[PDB]
Amino acid sequence: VVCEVDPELKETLRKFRFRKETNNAAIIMKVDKDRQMVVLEDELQNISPEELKLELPERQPRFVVYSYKYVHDDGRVSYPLCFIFSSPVGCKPEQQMMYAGSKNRLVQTAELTKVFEIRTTDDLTETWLKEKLAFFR
């Protein structure tokens, strides 16, 4: 069963993509099993990678869209929009797979091309993120 993206979430994501703010911000999303929908859990502003990490459940999956201010060594700035599938190894397989099966639809909805996955929340570090993003540099 593939979850639909909640229409309200699609709107949240659309507005977020085109935000004109230049701080780091995140949208965290979860599955509503009963509705078979991906829904908004939290929208957070001025959130660093470590703070984001600390928001994520350690043993349940989440989807994240993270708008990160990437400061190049010379001081140029980019604002990549990242998808992070947090799929901790301690989650039940059924729950992992429920999220995994809905990931692509969500990514497509959000029109995201930078799609990452972590298998423990500990792996969400700024270093990891920057290295991931540098592939698109």
Side-chain angles (χ1 to χ4, degrees), residues 2-107 109-137:
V2 180
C3 292
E4 282 233 319
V5 183
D6 180 279
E8 297 182 75
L9 181 54
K10 292 186 207 187
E11 254 312 271
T12 295
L13 286 167
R14 186 192 63 75
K15 295 175 175 147
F16 191 79
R17 164 177 284 277
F18 301 110
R19 62 197 305 262
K20 304 172 81 185
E21 283 83 12
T22 53
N23 57 352
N24 297 336
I27 289 171
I28 302 173
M29 298 155 285
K30 65 179 301 191
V31 170
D32 181 326
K33 276 189 67 41
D34 286 2
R35 272 178 87 197
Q36 289 176 209
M37 274 194 180
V38 181
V39 298
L40 182 63
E41 188 176 45
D42 275 296
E43 185 161 15
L44 298 182
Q45 304 283 321
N46 302 302
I47 186 162
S48 65
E50 183 184 19
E51 292 170 329
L52 175 62
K53 171 183 73 201
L54 291 171
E55 292 295 325
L56 292 172
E58 290 189 84
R59 298 172 292 280
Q60 292 83 45
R62 287 295 187 269
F63 302 125
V64 180
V65 174
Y66 190 41
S67 179
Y68 174 69
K69 181 180 159 191
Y70 184 106
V71 183
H72 299 257
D73 293 347
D74 74 353
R76 286 170 297 147
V77 181
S78 303
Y79 301 92
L81 192 63
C82 313
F83 185 88
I84 301 171
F85 179 27
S86 178
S87 187
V89 288
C91 79
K92 286 191 174 178
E94 178 179 355
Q95 187 180 37
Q96 199 292 143
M97 181 58 73
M98 173 169 81
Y99 279 75
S102 304
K103 185 191 83 184
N104 291 327
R105 182 169 297 168
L106 176 63
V107 165
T109 297
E111 303 183 335
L112 295 167
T113 59
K114 307 175 183 178
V115 179
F116 312 133
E117 180 173 325
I118 59 179
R119 301 305 305 277
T120 166
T121 59
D122 289 12
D123 281 354
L124 210 177
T125 66
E126 187 161 28
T127 292
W128 165 82
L129 184 61
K130 290 187 86 176
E131 288 180 359
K132 294 303 280 189
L133 289 170
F135 180 70
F136 302 90
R137 260 86 251 194

